Amino acid sequence: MVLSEGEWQLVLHVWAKVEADVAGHGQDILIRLFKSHPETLEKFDRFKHLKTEAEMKASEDLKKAGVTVLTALGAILKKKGHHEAELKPLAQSHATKHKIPIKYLEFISEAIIHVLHSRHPGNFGADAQGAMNKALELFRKDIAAKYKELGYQG
């Protein structure tokens, strides 16, 4: 997977919109993930018992998780694929400690796209959607390779 400078600039332009409200994007993205793929909520011992969207929006623990994933992913995207140093410790923790299947990184990727389109449709058109899909596929491909280096095929 390879992105053009142009495709990287589309990614960073929409990420600028995420950064106008990091915590609120984090909430929307994790709630979409948990509503669309409930099994993923079981991975978060601090908030796996939340059953409603209102309880999810009121949760400090969920809000903090949302900021964690979006600050990390923003930093990775700003590397424009030169993200070996960021992905190594992410693969280590998500493969060996959190036990997150590659399939769940595919789910949260879909949740990111869904929220970007829901919140920013005047801006997140077909070119932005294509470029972001390419950037999240590169992320998936590279972290999947790291998982295999650690002895996890999925």
Residues making contact with ligand HEM (CB under 6 A): 40, 43-44, 46, 68-69, 72-73, 90, 93-94, 98, 100, 104-105, 108
Nearer to ligand HEM, 62 or 122 (CB): 62
Closest approach of ligand HEM to the CB of residue 41, in Å: 8
Three-state SS sequence of 56-123: HHHCHHHHHHHHHHHHHHHHHHHCCCCCHHHHHHHHHHHHHCCCCCHHHHHHHHHHHHHHHHHHCCCC
Closest approach of ligand HEM to the CB of residue 79, in Å: 12
- CA torsion 67→93→132→77, rounded to 10°? 70
Closest approach of ligand HEM to the CB of residue 108, in Å: 4
Closest approach of ligand HEM to the CB of residue 66, in Å: 10
Burial tier of 95 (Cβ tally within 10 Å: 0-12, 13-18, 19+): buried
Nearer to ligand HEM, 30 or 122 (CB): 30
Nearer to ligand HEM, 10 or 112 (CB): 112
Write out the two tokens for 144: 């999947």
Judged by DSSP in three states, 52 sits in coil
Nearer to ligand HEM, 43 or 122 (CB): 43
